Structures are given as C-alpha cells and as structure tokens.
Design a protein around this ligand. Structure first.
Ligand code: BR
Ligand code: BR
Length: 208
C-alpha cells in the first residue's frame, strides 16, 4: 500500500521542534553497546551543551532511565519488551516491530530479532541487516502500522500499536477488531522493512 503518510508523519515526529532527529543515531549506537548512557556522555559525543540534550530528552517523554539517572532506553532499550533485538550475543530490546527493522542500518549491525504474534502468540523471528531481512520465520510475517499523532509521544501513540503477526491474514482478522486506531493498516514484514528504509534514508540525509 501507499506508505507515504506513515513515512511523512514519522519524519515529522522526529523533525518536530526539539525533536530527536540529530541525537537519535548517536544515542542508538551508544545504547547498542549494552550499557546505560549518561546525559553528560551523550552531550560530548554530540558536542551539544547540556541544556540542548536536556530539551530534546525532556520532549521525548518516554525515554527510559535507570536508578542512576542514566539513559537505558529510547527505541532501543535495555529494559525487557516483547521485541527482542540481539546483537553480537547481547540481548537488547525495542519498543515496536518497526523499530527492529530500522535500527540495524542506523547502528551498522545485524540483529537476530524475535517476538510473538500479537494475535495468536506464535513465535516469530528474523535476521535484520542494514540492507535486507533473512530467515523470516514464518515466511508470511506481517506488521501493524498506525498513523503517528501530532506532538504526541511516539511510544503510546505509535509504538504500542506496531506489532509483529504470524501472517497477513491472521493480522487482518486482528485489525478488523481495532478500527478505532488512526490509520490502522497491515503490511508484510518486507513492506515494513521498506518503510523503515525510506525513513532511514530521509533521516540520514537531514543529518549534519
Ligand atoms: Br498515499
Ligand atoms: Br521514532
């Protein structure tokens, strides 16, 4: 289907005033190491004053912190979710299915991704590299999409509705009971991977 509306609103969400756009890729590569990331440490990687890191993170209200106040989660997270994202034998997590498709290209790693079907609980897994997906199991895997909401925080408006499914027909039966979500749509995991590629392409080009 025509996914331009999802690309557009996802980009608008990160390019929004005080958006995450320019800190997102450096933060994700830092979290991919598997350790908490201090705000001060992130500021030096970015060469931003502390107040700028703070304003971005303050707007990103779903950012996850540990007991020491360090960053442990923003899309990619050290805190368990339904989306397992394993790099180099380190088990990390992601906030939603589409995140697992986007991150490999941004952090330059291949991930073994696993979850369960949101409609049936069936195990699903695949290998996501910067350029391709492989070992899609089961092969007909599907993803749900919704329209990101203006100014809303991404995780409650978008992430918590963006799931893996065992198949497009299973997913479409599930969707038929959730028509109250804005712009709900079902795509194959391949089409979702293509959407994330377009997101990443716009993201990287709009980066200093
Ligand atoms: Br369209
Ligand atoms: Br995002």
């Amino acid at each position: 289907m025509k996914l331009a509306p999802y690309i557009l609103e996802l980009l608008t969400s990160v390019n929004r005033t005080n958006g995450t756009a320019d800190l997102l890729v450096p933060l994700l590569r830092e979290l991919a190491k598997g350790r908490p990331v201090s705000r001060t440490t992130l500021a030096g990687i970015l060469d931003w004053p502390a107040e700028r890191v703070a304003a971005v993170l303050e707007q990103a209200t779903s950012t996850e912190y540990d007991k020491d106040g360090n960053i442990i989660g923003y899309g990619l997270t050290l805190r368990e979710t339904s989306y397992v994202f394993e790099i180099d034998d380190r088990r990390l997590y992601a906030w939603c299915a589409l995140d697992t498709l986007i991150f490999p290209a941004l952090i330059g790693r291949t991930a073994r991704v696993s979850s369960h079907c949101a409609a049936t609980g069936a195990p699903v897994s695949l290998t996501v590299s910067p350029s391709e997906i492989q070992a899609v199991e089961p092969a007909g895997m599907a993803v749900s999409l919704v329209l990101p909401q203006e100014a809303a925080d991404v995780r409650q408006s978008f992430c918590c509705h963006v799931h893996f499914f065992a198949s497009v027909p299973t997913a479409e039966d599930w969707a038929s009971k959730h028509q109250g979500l804005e712009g709900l749509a079902i795509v194959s995991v391949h089409e979702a991977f293509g959407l994330g590629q377009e997101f990443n392409r716009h993201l990287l080009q709009t980066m200093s």
